[PDB]
Amino acid sequence: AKSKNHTAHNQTRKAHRNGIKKPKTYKYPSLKGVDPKFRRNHKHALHGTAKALAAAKK
Amino acid sequence: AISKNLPILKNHFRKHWQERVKVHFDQAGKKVSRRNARATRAAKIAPRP
Amino acid sequence: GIDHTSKQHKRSGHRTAPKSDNVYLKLLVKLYTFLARRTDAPFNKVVLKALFLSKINRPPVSVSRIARALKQEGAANKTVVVVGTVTDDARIFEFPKTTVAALRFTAGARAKIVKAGGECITLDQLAVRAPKGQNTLILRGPRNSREAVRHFGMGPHKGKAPRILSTGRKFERARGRRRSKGFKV
Amino acid sequence: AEQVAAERAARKAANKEKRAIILERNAAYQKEYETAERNIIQAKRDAKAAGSYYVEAQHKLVFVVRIKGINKIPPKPRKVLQLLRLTRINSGTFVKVTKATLELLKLIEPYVAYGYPSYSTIRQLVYKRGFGKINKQRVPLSDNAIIEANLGKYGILSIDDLIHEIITVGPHFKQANNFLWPFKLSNPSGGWGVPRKFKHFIQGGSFGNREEFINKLVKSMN
Amino acid sequence: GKSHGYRSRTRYMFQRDFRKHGAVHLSTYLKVYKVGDIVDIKANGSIQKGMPHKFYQGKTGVVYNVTKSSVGVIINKMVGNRYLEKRLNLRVEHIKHSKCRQEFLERVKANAAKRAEAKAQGVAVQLKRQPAQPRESRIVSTEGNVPQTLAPVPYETFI
Amino acid sequence: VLKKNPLKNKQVLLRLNPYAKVFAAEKLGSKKAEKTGTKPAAVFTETLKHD
Amino acid sequence: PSRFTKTRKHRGHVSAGKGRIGKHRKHPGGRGMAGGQHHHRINMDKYHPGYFGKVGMRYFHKQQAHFWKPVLNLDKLWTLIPEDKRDQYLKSASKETAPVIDTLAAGYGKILGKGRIPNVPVIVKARFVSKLAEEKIRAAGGVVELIA
RNA sequence: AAUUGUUGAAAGGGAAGGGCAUUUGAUCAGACA
RNA sequence: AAUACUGCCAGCUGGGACUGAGGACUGCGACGUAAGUCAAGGAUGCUGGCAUAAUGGUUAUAUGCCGCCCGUCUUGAAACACGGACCAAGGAGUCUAACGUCUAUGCGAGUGUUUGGGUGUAAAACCCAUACGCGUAAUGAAAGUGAACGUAGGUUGGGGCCUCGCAAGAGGUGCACAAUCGACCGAUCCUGAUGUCUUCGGAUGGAUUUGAGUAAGAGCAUAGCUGUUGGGACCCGAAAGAU
RNA sequence: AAUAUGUAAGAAGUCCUUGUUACUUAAUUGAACGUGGACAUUUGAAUGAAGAGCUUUUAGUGGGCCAUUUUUGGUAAGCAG
Ligand SMILES: [Mg+2]
Ligand SMILES: [Mg+2]
Ligand SMILES: [Mg+2]
Ligand SMILES: [Mg+2]
Ligand SMILES: [Mg+2]
Ligand SMILES: [Mg+2]
Ligand SMILES: [Mg+2]
Ligand SMILES: [Mg+2]
Ligand SMILES: [Mg+2]
Ligand SMILES: [Mg+2]
Ligand SMILES: [Mg+2]
Ligand SMILES: [Mg+2]
Ligand SMILES: [Mg+2]
Ligand SMILES: [Mg+2]
Ligand SMILES: [Mg+2]
Ligand SMILES: [Mg+2]
Ligand SMILES: [Mg+2]
Ligand SMILES: [Mg+2]
Ligand SMILES: [Mg+2]
Ligand SMILES: [Mg+2]
Ligand SMILES: [Mg+2]
Ligand SMILES: [Mg+2]
Ligand SMILES: [Mg+2]
Ligand SMILES: [Mg+2]
Ligand SMILES: [Mg+2]
Ligand SMILES: [Mg+2]
Ligand SMILES: [Mg+2]
Ligand SMILES: [Mg+2]
Ligand SMILES: [Mg+2]
Ligand SMILES: [Mg+2]
Ligand SMILES: [Mg+2]
Ligand SMILES: [Mg+2]
Ligand SMILES: [Mg+2]
Ligand SMILES: [Mg+2]
Ligand SMILES: [Mg+2]
Ligand SMILES: [Mg+2]
Ligand SMILES: [Mg+2]
Ligand SMILES: [Mg+2]
Ligand SMILES: [Mg+2]
Ligand SMILES: [Mg+2]
Ligand SMILES: [Mg+2]
Ligand SMILES: [Mg+2]
Ligand SMILES: [Mg+2]
Ligand SMILES: [Mg+2]
Ligand SMILES: [Mg+2]
Ligand SMILES: [Mg+2]
Ligand SMILES: [Mg+2]
Ligand SMILES: [Mg+2]
Ligand SMILES: [Mg+2]
Ligand SMILES: [Mg+2]
Ligand SMILES: [Mg+2]
Ligand SMILES: [Mg+2]
Ligand SMILES: [Mg+2]
Ligand SMILES: [Mg+2]
Ligand SMILES: [Mg+2]
Ligand SMILES: [Mg+2]
Ligand SMILES: [Mg+2]
Ligand SMILES: [Mg+2]
Ligand SMILES: [Mg+2]
Ligand SMILES: [Mg+2]
Ligand SMILES: [Mg+2]
Ligand SMILES: [Mg+2]
Ligand SMILES: [Mg+2]
Ligand SMILES: [Mg+2]
Ligand SMILES: [Mg+2]
Ligand SMILES: [Mg+2]
Ligand SMILES: [Mg+2]
Ligand SMILES: [Mg+2]
Ligand SMILES: [Mg+2]
Ligand SMILES: [Mg+2]
Ligand SMILES: [Mg+2]
Ligand SMILES: [Mg+2]
Ligand SMILES: [Mg+2]
Ligand SMILES: [Mg+2]
Ligand SMILES: [Mg+2]
Ligand SMILES: [Mg+2]
Ligand SMILES: [Mg+2]
Ligand SMILES: [Mg+2]
Ligand SMILES: [Mg+2]
Ligand SMILES: [Mg+2]
Ligand SMILES: [Mg+2]
Ligand SMILES: [Mg+2]
Ligand SMILES: [Mg+2]
Ligand SMILES: [Mg+2]
Ligand SMILES: [Mg+2]
Ligand SMILES: [Mg+2]
Ligand SMILES: [Mg+2]
Ligand SMILES: [Mg+2]
Ligand SMILES: [Mg+2]
Ligand SMILES: [Mg+2]
Ligand SMILES: [Mg+2]
Ligand SMILES: [Mg+2]
Ligand SMILES: [Mg+2]
Ligand SMILES: [Mg+2]
Ligand SMILES: [Mg+2]
Ligand SMILES: [Mg+2]
Ligand SMILES: [Mg+2]
Ligand SMILES: [Mg+2]
Ligand SMILES: [Mg+2]
Ligand SMILES: [Mg+2]
Ligand SMILES: [Mg+2]
Ligand SMILES: [Mg+2]
Ligand SMILES: [Mg+2]
Ligand SMILES: [Mg+2]
Ligand SMILES: [Mg+2]
Ligand SMILES: [Mg+2]
Ligand SMILES: [Mg+2]
Ligand SMILES: [Mg+2]
Ligand SMILES: [Mg+2]
Ligand SMILES: [Mg+2]
Ligand SMILES: [Mg+2]
Fold first, then answer.
1. C164: which residues sit within 8 A by CB, 6+ positions away?
2. Which positions on chain I have an atom < 7 Å from some protein CB?
3. Which location does the Swiss-Prot or TrEMBL entry give for the cross-link Glycyl lysine isopeptide (Lys-Gly) (interchain with G-Cter in ubiquitin) (chain E)?
């Protein structure tokens, strides 16, 4: 009892039903996988300029 | 018989359980019977409490 | 024969009247369709919908989430509006005055509101006071504070609470949950 | 309470001014039209006179009707038929001619017949089977006030203001042409003329660009 | 059995260009990449370390990370019926700056000028791009240019 | 409640397009155009009748 | 009730909604948690990662109760005082007279410090405090009195 | 009910039964006022 | 000069067919000096026949054309694939324990009277003390420890509302929700202050690590469709095995 | 080459001014994130848009077969892929 082995027949039919959704885009993406030494210092950078701006409404 | 995202259950029903089911149909019965039992003990027991 | 571009005979998928059967609910719904049809004020259209929302989508607004809203700049005399029940919160020690209009106030929060000198309005008294919703501040409760949403989207590396009955170690915490028992998630 | 004839008067007078603007407008197009045509006729003459050859501008407007039914169509022409709003057999829309859409017409020649509409057939298309998309709701054009309400934004306050915007490919041909629902034509009333339809016009079938022969086709389908 | 190794099928994909083998020229390492740059991926067969997978060949993406010898490029590969986000760690030899944005930039600065100079003149701008319109009318001259009449030619063989 | 085609309904033909009366009244549909007489250059006639 | 059940609706169609190809046989996957390491492993890892194998220590004859120690935060705390009595002490916060709260009498075992209580002195009797809980009490002028 | 006898009506050139339609025969509702 | 051919006319005009939806008025117009009139947001006028089996419904037959046995499994059944001679009456997704999502309802940082007691017109209804269960804390194998730098943070989008403006629009505030960077609690790894029964103690500040966490609670309970597991488990079916 | 295929066509934009840091430079150098300021719908191609986005749960299915074109094995097949 052999039977069929493989086909991509009808698979693009299915994939197009509910879409092929575009990849979605966000302002402010994630820092995931960014260099750690950069992020460490950059954590302190935002902290600093955060503090300066509360000192701008003191 | 494993499918879907369901919590794994532990329903111990693999013995002949249907043999040992206790329905408290006599719940109202035995309360009536317990109340009368005390009303007799009250009267047997003289003024004792 | 037409080559259709969209599903045919598709319901809008938004509720139309509350699924509830409460007479009084249908009366408020009656009031507010009228208001929403003849007022051009947005607040009525919003309120009309919230009356349809199912109990999930009506998370309680705490009395303290309200007190917070009144601390917004220029928001402290606004009359907050909650289309749902309002719950008491023993964790704020000072509550402001103001006027809260809700579907329900719990025994606890109605006290805390009235005690501090406020007023508890039912949503139709609110209609009379503010047909265009003038000076209203609508608050919604937190919807995904629901417990069940912890288990939604469960899957590898999703960090997402297994549907479990009993918990503790001995309960889905070995193979596939730690580097030393096979793998981790 | 007045209004009775008071605001009847405010309106009926201003409804008389609108037809006034329309009459003086429709009169103008007419001058434009025939002088445009006479000018070209004299361009060609004055060229043979001057021992030379006058080549007209390539057409910029085209009218496309779906010839082919609904089923067994490959995905790419099938999208382009949807984008061209020809989703059923024998309906038809106007198309502005540019590189970016001349390449659309190419992709669907096996399924459509198109060509160059004359003022007469644009006129008799809008008048007889011209409808408007107004909150969808395919609305029959029947009164000039229907148009101005939805296209008055861009000029265009008469049914002929439309036809003028269409036939000349005006600045607002996109909004004017899209305001028109696809035209629903019947089968050609004298038949197709060819034995088999789904060959090119050049090969003795019906599809492709048959140029100004589209008018005899369309006029029978209207 | 079948074979499906990491560089399977890349015989010509990772070949070197004709008479262009050897060391990579020194500008490849003088180019500078910043977060947000649009880059094109083309693997260099001679540099095995830090090489993209054959799938990301010919593929364009955006850098999200800048390391010592490398750039992090996120790319949207579409698996199934959706796109996923893929971050790649390439070395500077396999990446290159995409001119796919130059036309845009060249058109932005130009658009500002066309707008400032027109505004400071008296409006009337029109600075969207339009497709190719059909040709206009024209009168072609016969002078010095009489039509040379042609006919089809008969059949021959010449073999 | 019933689309009346112009083209064959004068009443509605005049509800749209009030110029219809001008146009009918001045024939216009059969306008006799100007009689001129420019004849073609012989270059044109030669190459036409050529082979 | 049975009148709303979908099987009333399935009457008259051959298969009861269970498919003509695929049928509704007895147990196709096997009964119960059968094959969670085999034909059902895709569903066990994800939905149930961590299911197989051991972790930590055994503990013979553990009596929960030994570990009875409900927790209460400064968060609440003032709630252990009846509400009428409550406002009396919130005002007139002093030494000399400051409420005693027997948090074990309320059935709590430890006080944590979830956050911020008014600056009223409170005398807190409890079995266990957290460093913060205990510090935050003092900043209000209260003390913690270790009990048992 | 399957199935059977009698009576009455009707059709039948290697099955019967069915669809749309109408002639003919039988039968019947309603509506007029 | 004419004609053909091709195209146009908001030029005129005859014959034929099908339809007549709507039910006061309301609209856009047209003709008129005017009053009025109209073919202008869907049929009216005039005349006749029968008032009946005339028309219509049913039915049986004839005639034109058309129509293979249903059920099933199957890529494919009218099949030279299986079940079915006929009729009646039985005849198959149930109930339970424990659950997922959703929904309605009660009450809400709580909630759940019904093991029990009280009581009764007595398996009902009405009432209720102490507990208990789940929820209100997490995290470690564990010993243990245990959630505010700050208006409970910053940024960006947010309905709604507030202010200006006739309006178009501008500013203000912005719950829910989404994205992002931080802060807090535990695990892990560093750091190791003041002290000390000299080895106890672990403050403080940190780290591409990690948790089903904190960051002004959302839960508990009853019900119901669907879905899940154990049960004879939709109904009927072994060859066997045991006492 | 043809046909297929990656990315781009702006408000999440562009330009000036000059803050934050422990990263980085010989260096207030740069990198990253910002405060403040300048320019609106011809704001940056076309066509379409009975709207767009999102969430939860669950059925059936998991023997397929045919046609044009491309194509492997076989002399071939109403063959096998
Ligand atoms: Mg097999
Ligand atoms: Mg086979
Ligand atoms: Mg298979
Ligand atoms: Mg699944
Ligand atoms: Mg049991
Ligand atoms: Mg068993
Ligand atoms: Mg037993
Ligand atoms: Mg018994
Ligand atoms: Mg008894
Ligand atoms: Mg809802
Ligand atoms: Mg909400
Ligand atoms: Mg929680
Ligand atoms: Mg859930
Ligand atoms: Mg657990
Ligand atoms: Mg178009
Ligand atoms: Mg072409
Ligand atoms: Mg004819
Ligand atoms: Mg004919
Ligand atoms: Mg024909
Ligand atoms: Mg033929
Ligand atoms: Mg016709
Ligand atoms: Mg191989
Ligand atoms: Mg190769
Ligand atoms: Mg190596
Ligand atoms: Mg029932
Ligand atoms: Mg029913
Ligand atoms: Mg059904
Ligand atoms: Mg049925
Ligand atoms: Mg089913
Ligand atoms: Mg099936
Ligand atoms: Mg079956
Ligand atoms: Mg099958
Ligand atoms: Mg599996
Ligand atoms: Mg186990
Ligand atoms: Mg052990
Ligand atoms: Mg132990
Ligand atoms: Mg602490
Ligand atoms: Mg015979
Ligand atoms: Mg019949
Ligand atoms: Mg009468
Ligand atoms: Mg002619
Ligand atoms: Mg004519
Ligand atoms: Mg009528
Ligand atoms: Mg009628
Ligand atoms: Mg007049
Ligand atoms: Mg009339
Ligand atoms: Mg009669
Ligand atoms: Mg009679
Ligand atoms: Mg009759
Ligand atoms: Mg009668
Ligand atoms: Mg008669
Ligand atoms: Mg009759
Ligand atoms: Mg008979
Ligand atoms: Mg018959
Ligand atoms: Mg036949
Ligand atoms: Mg049958
Ligand atoms: Mg078979
Ligand atoms: Mg099948
Ligand atoms: Mg077959
Ligand atoms: Mg069959
Ligand atoms: Mg056979
Ligand atoms: Mg069989
Ligand atoms: Mg048989
Ligand atoms: Mg059965
Ligand atoms: Mg059931
Ligand atoms: Mg509720
Ligand atoms: Mg509590
Ligand atoms: Mg009871
Ligand atoms: Mg009683
Ligand atoms: Mg009794
Ligand atoms: Mg009582
Ligand atoms: Mg007691
Ligand atoms: Mg309790
Ligand atoms: Mg507990
Ligand atoms: Mg929990
Ligand atoms: Mg708490
Ligand atoms: Mg914790
Ligand atoms: Mg613990
Ligand atoms: Mg310790
Ligand atoms: Mg800190
Ligand atoms: Mg600190
Ligand atoms: Mg920032
Ligand atoms: Mg705003
Ligand atoms: Mg803001
Ligand atoms: Mg930490
Ligand atoms: Mg750890
Ligand atoms: Mg550990
Ligand atoms: Mg937990
Ligand atoms: Mg909570
Ligand atoms: Mg809830
Ligand atoms: Mg459901
Ligand atoms: Mg089952
Ligand atoms: Mg058996
Ligand atoms: Mg047996
Ligand atoms: Mg036996
Ligand atoms: Mg055996
Ligand atoms: Mg024996
Ligand atoms: Mg080529
Ligand atoms: Mg493309
Ligand atoms: Mg500084
Ligand atoms: Mg700014
Ligand atoms: Mg566009
Ligand atoms: Mg285009
Ligand atoms: Mg459009
Ligand atoms: Mg829409
Ligand atoms: Mg599914
Ligand atoms: Mg398989
Ligand atoms: Mg499956
Ligand atoms: Mg199968
Ligand atoms: Mg081939
Ligand atoms: Mg084959």
1. B7, B8, C171, C172
2. 6-11, 21-22, 27-31, 38-42, 71-75, 93-110, 114-120, 122-124, 136-137, 141-143, 145-148, 150-152, 154-156, 159-162, 172-183, 207-208, 211-214, 216-220, 224-234, 237
3. 31
